[PDB]
Structures are given as structure tokens and as C-alpha cells.
Paper text:
The RimK system allows for Pseudomonas spp. to adapt through post‐transcriptional regulation by altering the ribosomal subunit RpsF. RimK belongs to the ATP‐dependent carboxylate‐amine ligase superfamily of enzymes 13 , 24 which includes other members which can add amino acids to the C‐terminus of their target proteins. Each individual RimK unit has a classical ATP‐grasp fold with an elongated shape of approximately 60 x 35 x 30 Å. 25 The glutamate binding domain of each RimK subunit is linked to the ATP‐binding central domain by a flexible linker region, which is likely to allow the protein a range of motion to enable it to act like a classical “clam shaped” enzyme.
RimKPA was crystalized in the absence of its substrates; ATP, cdG, and glutamate whereas RimKPS was crystalized with both ATP and cdG present in the cryoprotectant. ADP and glutamate, of presumed cellular origin, were resolved in the RimKPA structure whereas ADP alone was resolved in the RimKPS structure. RimKPA has a slightly more closed tertiary structure in the center of the protein, leading to a more occluded active site that contains the predicted glutamate binding pocket. This occlusion is due to several factors, including the addition of a small section of β‐sheet in the core of the protein as well as the divergence of H2. In this study, we were able to resolve a peptide fitting the profile of poly‐α‐glutamate chains of either three or five amino acids long, in the active sites of seven out of eight of RimKPA monomer subunits. RimKPA chain A was examined in more detail as it was the most complete monomeric unit with a fully resolved structure as well as both ADP and glutamate bound. Interactions between side chains and residues less than 3 Å away were examined, confirming that the second resolved glutamate residue (E2) interacts with S68, E3 interacts with S7, R8 and R64, E4 interacts with S14 and finally E5 interacts with N262 and R189. Conversely, the addition of increasing concentrations of RimBPA led to a reduction in RimKPA ATPase activity, suggesting that there are important, intrinsic differences between the responses of these two proteins to their corresponding binding partners.
Numbering used by the authors:
A (entry chain P), B (entry chain K), C (entry chain M): 11 to 15
D (entry chain A): 1 to 292
E (entry chain D): 1 to 293
F (entry chain F): 1 to 205, 219 to 290
G (entry chain C): 1 to 212, 218 to 289
Amino acid sequence: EEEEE
Amino acid sequence: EEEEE
Amino acid sequence: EEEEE
Amino acid sequence: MKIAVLSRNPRLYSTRRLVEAGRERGHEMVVIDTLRAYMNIASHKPQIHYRGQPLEGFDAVIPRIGASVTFYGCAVLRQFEMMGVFPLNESVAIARSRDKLRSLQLLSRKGIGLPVTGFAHSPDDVPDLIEMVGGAPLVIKLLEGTQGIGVVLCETEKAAESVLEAFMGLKHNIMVQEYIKEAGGADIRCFVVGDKVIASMKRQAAPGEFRSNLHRGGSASLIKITPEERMTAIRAARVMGLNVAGVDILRSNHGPLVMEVNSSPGLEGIESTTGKDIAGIIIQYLEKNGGP
Amino acid sequence: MKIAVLSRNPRLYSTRRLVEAGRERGHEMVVIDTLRAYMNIASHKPQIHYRGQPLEGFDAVIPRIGASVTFYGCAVLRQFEMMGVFPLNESVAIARSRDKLRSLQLLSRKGIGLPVTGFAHSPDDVPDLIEMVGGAPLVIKLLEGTQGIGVVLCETEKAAESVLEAFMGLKHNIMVQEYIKEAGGADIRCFVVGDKVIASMKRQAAPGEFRSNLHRGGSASLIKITPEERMTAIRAARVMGLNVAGVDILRSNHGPLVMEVNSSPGLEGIESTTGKDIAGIIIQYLEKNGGPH
Amino acid sequence: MKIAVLSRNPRLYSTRRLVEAGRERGHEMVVIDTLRAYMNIASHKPQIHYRGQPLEGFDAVIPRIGASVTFYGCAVLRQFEMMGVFPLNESVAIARSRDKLRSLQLLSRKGIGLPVTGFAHSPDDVPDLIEMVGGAPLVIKLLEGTQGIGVVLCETEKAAESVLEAFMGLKHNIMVQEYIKEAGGADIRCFVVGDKVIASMKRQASASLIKITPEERMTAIRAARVMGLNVAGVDILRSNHGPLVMEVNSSPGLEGIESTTGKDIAGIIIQYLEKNG
Amino acid sequence: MKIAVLSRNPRLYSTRRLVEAGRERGHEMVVIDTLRAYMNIASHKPQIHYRGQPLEGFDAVIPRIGASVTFYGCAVLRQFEMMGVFPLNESVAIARSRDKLRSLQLLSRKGIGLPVTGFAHSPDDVPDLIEMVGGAPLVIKLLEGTQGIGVVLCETEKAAESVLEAFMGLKHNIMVQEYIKEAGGADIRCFVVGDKVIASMKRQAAPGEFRSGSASLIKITPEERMTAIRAARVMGLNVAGVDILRSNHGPLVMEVNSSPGLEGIESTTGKDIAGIIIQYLEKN
């Protein structure tokens, strides 16, 4: 979710 | 995790 | 203790 | 019956299994994401809305309310209760069990076996607090409202002094407990439904690690519980006002000590170890108490 | 009597006044900083320690537990209760009143007059939520556990849509209430002790400002409350299980509506407006219910 | 090469693919959970420990540092840099790009196309702020440190006034932007590696292929170079005043762009490390 | 000159004194509440608005940006810089100094004396971490972004183990430092202005408490003087409070503060520090 913004 | 404590 | 430390 | 399951994730083992077991037995099972329910609390027109539509015709509700959303989850459950829907566990009981300080004081008052336990926030005399609970070694638990943040073994007085000094001014609530070394990193999970322990298991922590959660990478096995453990688990649930509860017990030299009373216990560990249809037994409980 | 006052600051108007009033009436008044009390929770010889020593010979306790420390404050109060010390307000009642969602649902269930009120966290359909509670104008409150974080008046549908979308990114609990325009920015504070309103005042918000706090720049005056308002204030306190409560009431077109039930009401506003010894009346309540009898 | 991937989850599409692509091309790929690395900074020789052992013989590192762990992730990356390990993106550039206020001020100063934009925290004159950015409708973005918390359309002056009044005293940093209605809910994601857009897609509120203009291509490349990033996702809105940069991401996802274009993006990133480490 | 002071409270000792000193010396001193400034970002005619009006004709700005508002304060300061206003300290230097992890790594890289220091978040091997930094006794600091949250002296290995296990559940950044016992609870605060230490004081912690408590005059060594000046220059700061421990391995930098207090240093030395800061702005 976060390391792929 | 949280609902399966 | 923020802009006076 | 039409049964709501208040769960934030319908893919979770316990939620899936409750839905599966309900459908095997001819019930309409609907998973409601607790946080996506919104409500009118007007007495002349009470509503629970969900994705633009009202929720109608529910006979019972199974609350699987995570600790981080206790206040809102209890508001959604309370609303179901006010609308005549039968709760597996009552809102007041779930709220009570999630307040760890209140839970321990109630279990203590009712003569349930507990580790020697102290509470603090900003104590001026840390050595006095450490002496009160029988000195080191002791376990320090860090609480923020309705959530456990950490659990720490302090082997010496100076280690207890350092943890307490560190947490003073971090605005956490602090539990100090005698270390039950004689348990050897094992605890007993008793699955309570009504006035019965329907299943139990031993959880063993990996060698070194004292914290024995299956979540924290510890192994599980069958166990024959003592009549005293059986009675303690049942009484702890009844004292909390819960119909369905996981009760965690440490085998101490002064008999069984209750560590946890959980209003939303996991099914994965207990079902894979015992082979029992726990989900089914829970559905059966709703049939006998909430439905035709 | 020996009376504990659970207060984090003994210089606060209300704590000072309770200590003053207690001493005028021959009581030993001891201010206990709630967070500096620590305890062994054994049933069989129950004790509270404070600055290295046990607390002994307390007859009663006045909880002034701030909302940020409700859980720990209620644990210290519960311990006093288990030791046979008489609480001005019970721990279960203070905890209940600090859970705003639970308070509203209980008052509603017991047929106490309330503004039309909605709860949400992460609703998929904001327009549906706004419609449910009767549309704009409405007041939107942000709650984090036992604490109010923010309050906005949203005069239009689009303003309500924007505030709710904004607050949904904070992952807090959201209260939506109809704005009671017919009150004309006035509310009644009723000070309840036992089964009586012992004092009341009208708070008028400054023109523009919708919040009628004296903190938010609003004026206060004396008021004669109706028998229905009097009964509503008393019932709200009894329903919450509180012996002492501040109850805030709006005069609406559907009768008196309860806005707030406070377990730890301020004395400054009500005392300076009425001139009444409210602190004294509270001490009197403890004498009649918690003391030698 | 021996290549570290700083990622908290090795099961994530982008981390899996970078590991896969590296191994196809004969490299030793090691996923390091950023938060499980601990370090001695002061002493005779800079080292990073991980699960009881030092990390040795790394040639390059691919930082996939999530926004919530920017400070610690940049400290671990900075340590790799001090030990002579080649970073895909430099620590200073990742830190800069995660500070949204600083990023916009830098892109603005360097003449990159931006929506008309205002900053506020506790403004005394909300109507003045709303007028400054060209009035309603406008978008309000809420920032807490290095993280975007929400994005909200305010269709009217009164809706903008209410959101700003609500957030005043909530201790968030506030961005106010002109609403680019003419984009019709579409944006362009340009995947930049070195001085090239190697892939792009249209996102509609679904994803599709797109032919970007020479101006959009140049804007994406310049935005990355200005931020000091070798690898960046640049998000662009097609406005009536040309392409406007919305986002420069130091750790762009591969799933959306790879499934839409069919291109080996992971491979091209590994190729970049081969040519420059 | 017209000088802006970015301060959230004009009644604070340091802000009052800077305003006082500026006015004694014929300057127009304006206190700007950092959070009440709002801005349009545009390279052509860059402006800052405040209470409905633009801020115009400012020659210099003194940033007193509190650690909790570093990002927004640096955005307001950066805007002043882009408009050609002279900053007492640069935005990039203030941001750098507020990132404690980055500050230590930079000072270390430039050979400035530091306590042996480790960083951790969720280490799997706590005993290894404790061994790496030379074992107990050690000081354990909790960091959340640009703010220090907590400080603990751990006298024994078991106390360090317990504190680290406790703090690992808070999901904050963890600093571990060797305890400099030989300092006997004293530190030196060196007030640096333009590559000179203009004033210094010894701070002594109350008996028991290891965290600095009383203050006194001190004659600093040439090595301490050079260390304080170099630490400020390495951070890129013209005005800095540098805290130094007298260790058995020479002077160790504990803290480089971009917004040092004036009350402690002025009441102990009797020096017009506010004045010297104003003088720096006049000369530059």
C-alpha cells in the first residue's frame, strides 16, 4: 500500500 | 491479527 | 522547552 | 436466522469460518465492516446504514471488534442491541473486557486467580511500587486506553526501575506483575461458550522468548485442563458478562492465574489443534438463545 | 471527614474552592494528583500508595478526573470504592459519561430529549449520512476515545460534505448533530446535585460565534428554568448514574434537548453568575451520604 | 552485483519483481527489512547489523522506503552511502521529495508547471487565502510531517471556509490548490529512469495506454532531475495552461505501469544499476 | 533594518530580548507567528501574507522555529529566502539539525567528537546492539520524526535489554549512546555566532538526576572552542547552541540547536547575547 505510492 | 486475539 | 532549549 | 458479523476483514480465518458454519446450518450470514456502518441515534427513527442502504431484518450479531476500534465498534453493536438484535456478546461486556485495568480489578474483587499485580502512571516512589508486587523479576505491561502496547521481562530491580523511569512522562498506563517463571513460557487458552469450556490448548513460546503468542511465532498442543482451570475460565467469562470468551491461564505454584479475557478470540489456533467445529458451536449457541 | 480530591492541579478554581469549602466545614481536604497514585489490586487488604506512603482513613473522594486520563483516573477511583471510600460520583458513571457515543445512545434509549444525532467513522456515502440526520445546517464533532478533538458548524450541504471528507482522513469517530437555530445561540447550564437542580445560568454566544463557552467569548446571565427543563436535567444525571453533573440544555421547538452531561463540571461560571456556594452544597452532599450517619 | 532492496515486505509486487529481475540478470538480490537494520555510527569503520550479523559486500541498494518511516529509512540508506554502496536514489533526494511543501517550492522556483497552490496552518484571513489561489472550486490537501492525510474537493467558498475552520487547531499543514476540472478525473503517471520517461499510463476515476506530449515528457524528466532522483514516478494533470506536476514519488509502484504497458520496468531499473554501479 | 522574528509567542524571554535588542539599535522588529503566515508558491513576485496583508520591506528574518512545527516553519523561512530576505540561519541547515539521526551521521563523517552512538527501530538481536555501542551503562533516547520523546539511563545490560524491549513496542526511532560518567553530570553549552563562541556556561545536573539543575561560568579549552565552532559550520548554522561533554576521549558534541535559548546563558554570563545576534545581522 505504502512502498508502492 | 487484531480480531483474532 | 521548544524554541528556548 | 439473519446474522451480522461485525468484522473489518471478511477474508480472516475466524470471520470466514463463522460465515461458513452459519451457511452450513441454513442461516443468512452478512459480514458488516464495523467502520463503514453509520447511524441515526434518533429514538423516533433509529437506523444503521451501510453503503447507502439501511440494515434490516437481522436476528443476531457476532461482534469481532478489534481493540483499536472498541469505542466505535461498541456504538455499532449497542445500536443493533437497541433495535432488538441478539448480540453473541453484549456491548457493555466487550467495553468492560477491553479496559484491562477495570478487568483486573473486577476479577480480583471476585476472587479469580491473578498474578500479584500493581498499577502506576507517574509514581514518585518506584522502589515502593516494585516492593508492593514482591520485587524482581516482574513483567511490565504498557497500556494506551483499550490496547496493550508492550510486555517486558525485568529480571532485576534496576531493570524495573529503568523501564518505569523511561515510561514516566510517556503518558502510558503501566501494569507491574510477578513473573510466573514456573510456567516455562507456556499458557493455556480455554475457549468458553455459555457455562462450558468447549475446547482448550497449550501455547509454548520459542526457546528464549517468554511471550507465547502463536501470532509471535509460538507452537500449540493438546492439553487436559484441571477442574480448577475449567471453573476459573467459566467464572472469568461470567464475571466479565461474556457468553463467548478466550481465557488465557498461567499454571503457577499458587494454581491457575488468568492473564487475558478476550471478547473476540481467534478460531485458527484452537480449531487446527483440537479439530473441533468451534464456529459451529458458536452458531448453535445463537440458535438456542437468539433464534427459533 | 477526611476527603480526597482527585485533581492534577490544586491551583484550579474548582479544586481550590472544593478544598476551601471542605475546610470551612471542619473537614481534612487532601488533593491527590491522580497520576502519582499507584496501587496493588489485591481484594483482601486493598491499598493506594502516594509519594511512598499508603493513603489511610479517607471517608470520601471527589473525582475531578480530566478526560485525557479517564481510564487511569477511574482505576484509582475504583480502588477507593473497593476500600469502602464514598465516591461523589461512581467510577462506572464517570467512564460512561466520558464515552460521548454511549452517553447519547443511553439518553436516547431512555427518552431524554436530544438533537437529531448521527455517528460515522468511514462511511462510503457521505450524502446519505447528511440526509439521515436532516441535512445542513449541522454541527460536526471529532471524537478520539473519551476526548472531543474539534467542533465545526457546517451551514450548507457542500460544507458538511467537505468537513466529513476532510475528517475521514483522521480516522477518528465523527458525531453529526442538527443545529438548533431556534435557541438563538443560547443554552442553559443546570448544576445537578442529588435529585435537585441547585443552580442554573443562561450562556449566550457572541453574534457570529455559535459556541457559547465563556472561553469562546460569550456572556452569562441568571435564568428561571421550566419544570420540564428541571426534570430533564435531574433525569439525565440519574440515567447517567451521576450524583453531581453539569447538564447543558437547548430550548428547541420539540422541548428541552440535552447537549452535554459532564461528570466534573466547572464551578467558576455558575458561582460568579448565581453567587451561590456550589462547592459548599457539594460538601453538604458528602456529609449527608458519605460521612457519620 | 550484490544488491540490497530496503523493503518492509518481500511479498509486495514491486519488491518481488525487483528481486526476480535482479536474479534473471545474474545478481545476488537480498531484501533488507529497513526497521530490522541497526547501526553503529560513531567509531572506526561504518557498519550496518541485521539479525545479529554485519551486512558486507553490497555493491548497490534499492530504497523502497515507505513515507511513515522516511527518517529511519534515510538513516539506513545514508549509512549504505557512507560505506561506498551505490544508491538507486540518494538519501537527500528521497528526504527532499517526501517534504511536500519543500518539493512544491523547489519545482515552482525551477519553473516546473504546477497548479496555483497556497500553504497555510492557522491563517487569520481565510477569505484572503481562498482569493490568493483563485477562489472555489479548490482542492484542500492535509499534510502531517512527511505523509498526505487527505485530499478534499471544496466546490464553494463556504465549503473551503468550513474545512479550513475545522482544521485550524488540528495541527495539520494545509495545501490549497486550484481544482483542475478540465482533466475530467484523469492524470498521467510518467515512470522516469535517468534522463528518460521509460513508460507512462493514463489513470481515470481504471488505467490505459497514453501517448504523452514532448512537453509532458520534458516536464517529467526535469521534475525528477530537479528533485535529484534517478528513478521517480511523476504524476501530471493535462490543464488548460499545459501539463502540471501533482506528485514526484521516489518509490513508485510497478504493478499498475507494468500490467498496462507490458514493459520489464524492474529489468530497466536493474540495467540502470549495472550502467552506474 | 526591518527584521522579522518567526516566534509563536512574543512574550517568551528569547523573542522579547531579540525585539528589545533590535529596537535599542534602531531596527524595526516585527514578531511573525510562524503558523499564521500563509503563502502563494510562485517564482515571479513571491509573497507571504499575514492577517490579510502582504509582508514587504523585510531585510532579515530570525527563525525561532519550534521542533514540533519544523516542516511548516522551514516552508515560511524558505519563502522569505526566495524573496531575498537574509535568514540568521538557513532553512536547509535548520531542517538538517532537527533530524537527529542525520545530524549525528554528518558530524561523525566530518570527524567531530561524538559519544559512541547506535540507531535501531526493531532489531532482532538486542544483546548484539548493546555490545556494538560498548555495553552498559548507556543512555537510550526515543525519537519521533524531528522531536526527542524520552531519555533513560540504563546502568546494567539487563536494564538496557528491558528498556529496548519496552520501546520496540512504541514503533519510534531509538538512539543508544555510551554514558559519559566521567563528565560527573556536567555539560558545556557554547553559544556560537559566526565562527566564534561568544559565550559559554557549565550546566550541572541535581544530585541523582543525570539529565542537566544549576549553571555556572566556565573557561573552555581551545579544543572545546574549536569543536563548538566546527559543529556549527558542519551543520551550516551561523547561530547555534552546541552542548559538549568533557570525556576521556576529548570534547563530545551532544546537541547542535538552531534556536538556542538566551535566558540561561544571559543570566549566567551577564552578556547582551540578543545584541550580538542583532550585530551579526547588521554586519551580514
